[PDB]
Amino acid sequence: TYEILGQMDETFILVKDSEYLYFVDQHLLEERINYEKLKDENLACRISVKAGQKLSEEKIRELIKTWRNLENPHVCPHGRPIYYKIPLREIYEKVGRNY
Amino acid sequence: TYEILGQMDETFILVKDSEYLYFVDQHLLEERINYEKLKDENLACRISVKAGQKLSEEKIRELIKTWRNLENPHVCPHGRPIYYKIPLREIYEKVGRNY
Ligand SMILES: [Mg+2]
Ligand SMILES: [Mg+2]
Ligand SMILES: [Mg+2]
Ligand SMILES: [Mg+2]
Ligand SMILES: [Zn+2]
Ligand SMILES: [Zn+2]
């Protein structure tokens, strides 16, 4: 139901479905995953993590599959959006194509 | 000065620099390249090309290098934008990060 486009700035993973392009914050995603494993209300939010990390394609595949099966895939436990999404339609329109 | 993120929908190539993320229309790009080779005022605009084409990573590298060295990299000969660009800052802001 989705396609992984790859990593950007060692900070975001780009994934798309039939409607949207998602920029998935890999730090906020790992934060949510570890929270669902271990619901620790008191862990520091990873919005402060600045250094990038190059991920293997296998690790990206595992992270994005986990994300797609998450019960709360939209926001970290602190309420920061895990991703920013863009309608594919917008991208097509900007070069003159209908989607 | 740029980084190739990869192909989307067999229609766009994603490339970024230090400021922007570019969605490069591969058909309009090839149109501009063939125009600079062969300045034919009367060739049909490729805005109508609908079918996708999976490109090799080598071919994508050659296309994007050519694009980056183009004298007119912004628009096809008919005036359709070859790319849509997004400030990286916007993407970072949407998850709560400053860029
Ligand atoms: Mg959620
Ligand atoms: Mg939810
Ligand atoms: Mg131009
Ligand atoms: Mg010009
Ligand atoms: Zn958080
Ligand atoms: Zn044209």
Swiss-Prot record, chains A, B:
It comes from the Bacteria. Belongs to the DNA mismatch repair MutL/HexB family. This protein is involved in the repair of mismatches in DNA. It is required for dam-dependent methyl-directed DNA mismatch repair. May act as a 'molecular matchmaker', a protein that promotes the formation of a stable complex between two or more DNA-binding proteins in an ATP-dependent manner without itself being part of a final effector complex. This is DNA mismatch repair protein MutL. The chain holds residues 327 to 425 of 425 of the full protein.
